[model samples]
Target: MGHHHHHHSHMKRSGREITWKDFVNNYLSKGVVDRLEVVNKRFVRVTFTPGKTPVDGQYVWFNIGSVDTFERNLETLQQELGIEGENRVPVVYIAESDG
Candidate 1:
């Protein structure tokens, strides 16, 4: 659906780069996730709400292997973790690739 070698834009991502484990341990458990953004179905942006401890730049970015598994895992995690109803983190999708 798209052409190759279109790497025209360059960027330096500013937020703290985090691993999935780090996110789950540090942010997810704390219930501080304000929203979740999936960029190009490959990248995840975890934004936080104002809380007891300050988060660096208010967000974190990480790479995902695939969305299917990611979604399943998140749903299961939330189910087990019990972040129900309005307390559940909202997820958003972004078509634009950040590369």
Candidate 2:
């Protein structure tokens, strides 16, 4: 597949330009994420339940804010972090600069 980063997307919402960082906090932290089913894996759209819910309650997410390929899984993330489970995975890793 032809994969690219930032080829993902950064769109406008609430009368302002939305950054990936903003989405992660404001949306992904509250509602459900349903990938928009586009080619090149460009984006996912969010809907409300108030706070973000994982695409599935069981998957893993890494802190970049990083985006991983679809072929990978929670185990892939587990290996990369050298630990297991939500408790072991960090809550946030943006202790320094963020993209």
Give the least accurate 10-residue stretch of model 1, judged by summed lDDT.
Answer: 1-10
lDDT by residue for model 2 (1-99), tens: 223323455422212234444554554433343322212233323333323433232222222222354224433544654644432322211221231
- Best candidate (score: lDDT): 1
Screening candidate 2 with a backbone cut-off below 3 angstroms (N, C-alpha, C), the clashing residue pairs are: 29-52, 30-51, 30-52, 31-51, 31-52
Q: Can you tell me which runs of candidate 2 are displaced by over 4 Å?
A: 1-17, 32-40, 47-99
Per-prediction TM-score, please? 0.73, 0.25
Candidate 2, residue 20: lDDT = 46
lDDT of 1 by residue, 49-68 (tens): 75633433435788876977
